[PDB]
Design a protein around this ligand. Structure first.
Ligand SMILES: Cc1cc2nc3c(=O)[nH]c(=O)nc-3n(C[C@H](O)[C@H](O)[C@H](O)COP(=O)(O)O)c2cc1C
Ligand SMILES: Cc1cc2nc3c(=O)[nH]c(=O)nc-3n(C[C@H](O)[C@H](O)[C@H](O)COP(=O)(O)O)c2cc1C
Lengths: 350, 350
């Protein structure tokens, strides 16, 4: 069997009516599915454990994930090899701790709340891959390191030092965070993982056979930033927000990397360095998107590739053929590299 | 008043005897201090809330932090402006949920456990600064960005690409993690903050008036790595583990930086770039530790400074005078840059 534990937050205040309406329907649907477990209610927070056949659990959780009466739904635990039920006589016992006033319940209830709100804080500082892994039934702490092929993505804000020199600190952070949010949303939707931010830089990666999605994600970022630039208020620093992007391909190590008290689940390898060095050349090459011939040849769609140059850094003393894609968006975004050379006056006056 | 909530793990199995011995003494000491609250016991895990005068709470928590009967002690919440007690009639009610078998207690107990073990996982992926902030009574999510002077620290493993080419993936990660652990331990003890790992690189920072501690931390890292090298088993990759270190000083932005779902509490600014670019020059300059004249002049101890060169990168078209310190350890560590140029054969045979 499968057992799922999740927490969520009320989307909006819920009445006494609506809460037992939820318990009523859940218990009826679970009874029919031979699913058991507990739904707990505490100060605008839901906790639920559900157990049964994996196929039925998955369809139930799918509806739960779509229910607009709660949000911020987070799976804390997924066990997919359960031999014995934890809550057998109850299709869906609902328990409401708000109305509760039992005696040793009161200390446990404030404990539950403080643990949950502390957990919500830590969630904001946690890589999204960690919660994905947990939702697949895997403890991330026990993943062993592996060699894997990846497409590595690296991007940054053009002339970011000008933003930091000219703007108040709150506006610098607003710009960076806006940029990071655009990139993260598109990368995640295209099947990639944003694994690190460093300075105003984004490091991300895609599966090794997903060069098409990496390229499409890069073009979508450029398109979204175009929308953001031309939709921003007059005088806004967002009007001169441009990105460079570099993609590389290679075998890297994936796993838990860090000190004893603080690790990241992330990647390590030469392709990370190549992607960052290619991204650095966007300015000199007058191309907003640059990638290696290995990325180019690994792609299977008929992108309009343009050869840029043959050069190198490193390290390994090997030359690399560098490509972009030639379309209206990359031409406009590449022109933005030039524009961003002299945005100091524009930024001085926001 | 002040109210503290923390969790901990048993250091070792604790008997029925020892647990009420803890409750017995705690209740007696709290009664004398006019401290109230609750200590909860659940499957080798402690939860406690304590409330009272800040000075008495701090002295009590100090003893709790020293008690070898528990470990992994983590403050989830510190409220330092409490006007009203949450648990007034009880100096230290102790509650043991293991022995408990009440009816709606059972679902809440498995909930408490799953929340706690999920929290413990997330702790391993969380910057240490976040828990420090929480322990000071501050929610990190509501810190506003600020401009602050910092000394920025950047370091990496010399010829790391050779380790990744020659060693099995498990041994590559073991080396990197060992290095990261050495650096983090020393930096934290010297009052700094390790804020990011990228590749085999460590980024950290110290208060702007703490150049002496930054320099001492750097020298201690070099000394610890010497101990690690000369103490490692024969043939071990750790025998050829060397570091470069660069320090820079400047005004940076500190605050929450990232996408909507994932942020870091970290720094942003030119001094980060300068520190990384200085660290990159360690090889060309044949000096394991390099730093800017601003770091040099900001220090107040009589380090044996040696001027290295006048050069630049950037960006800003300004030259920088680069320094090191000349002692036996930096000479030996700098010689290690040369040794690390040709460790491929040594590493091929581990
Ligand atoms: C907090 C919460 C918990 C829920 N738990 C369950 C559940 O355990 N089983 C279930 O069938 N529906 C549960 N639901 C309701 C589903 O989201 C959905 O409303 C219902 O199952 C779909 O019914 P339908 O088959 O007519 O579409 C829950 C809803 C909420 C808000
Ligand atoms: C889980 C746990 C909770 C404790 N809580 C308290 C407490 O609330 N108040 C207290 O005085 N001691 C508490 N202690 C015990 C202290 O660590 C320490 O043993 C004792 O207070 C010191 O007594 P002393 O003044 O003779 O040194 C706790 C110990 C443990 C293991």
């Amino acid at each position: 069997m499968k057992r799922l534990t999740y927490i969520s937050k009320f989307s909006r205040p819920l009445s006494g009516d609506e809460i037992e309406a939820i318990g009523r329907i859940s218990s009826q649907k679970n009874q029919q599915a031979n699913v058991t477990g507990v739904l707990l209610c505490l100060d605008g927070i839901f906790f639920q454990i559900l157990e049964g056949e994996a196929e039925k659990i998955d369809r139930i959780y799918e509806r739960i994930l779509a229910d607009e009466r709660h949000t911020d739904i987070l799976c804390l635990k997924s066990e997919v090899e359960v031999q014995e039920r934890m809550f057998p006589d109850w299709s869906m016992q609902t328990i409401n701790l708000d109305e509760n006033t039992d005696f040793l319940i009161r200390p446990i209830k404030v404990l539950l709340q403080t643990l949950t709100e502390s957990h919500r804080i830590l969630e904001k500082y946690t890589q999204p891959s960690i919660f994905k892994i947990i939702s697949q039934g895997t403890n991330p702490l026990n993943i062993r390191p592996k060699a894997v092929e990846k497409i590595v993505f690296f991007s940054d804000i053009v002339s970011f030092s000008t933003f930091a020199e000219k703007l108040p600190v709150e506006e610098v952070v607003s710009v960076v965070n806006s940029y990071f949010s655009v990139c993260t949303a598109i990368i995640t939707r295209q099947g990639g993982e944003v694994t690190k931010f460093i300075g105003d830089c984004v490091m991300a990666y895609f599966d090794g056979d997903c060069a098409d999605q990496a390229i499409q994600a890069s073009l979508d970022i450029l398109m979204e930033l175009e929308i953001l630039r031309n939709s921003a208020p007059e005088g806004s620093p967002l009007r001169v927000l441009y990105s460079g992007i570099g993609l590389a391909k290679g075998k890297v190590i994936e796993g838990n990397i860090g000190s004893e008290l603080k690790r990241d689940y992330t990647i390590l390898g030469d392709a990370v360095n190549v992607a960052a060095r290619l991204e650095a050349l966007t300015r000199q090459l007058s191309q907003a998107l640059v990638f290696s011939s290995e990325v180019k040849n690994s792609a299977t769609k008929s992108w309009n590739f343009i050869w840029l140059t043959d050069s190198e850094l490193k390290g390994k003393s090997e030359s690399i053929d560098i490509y972009s894609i030639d379309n209206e968006m990359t031409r406009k975004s590449s022109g933005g590299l030039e524009i961003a050379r002299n945005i100091g006056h524009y930024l001085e006056r926001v």
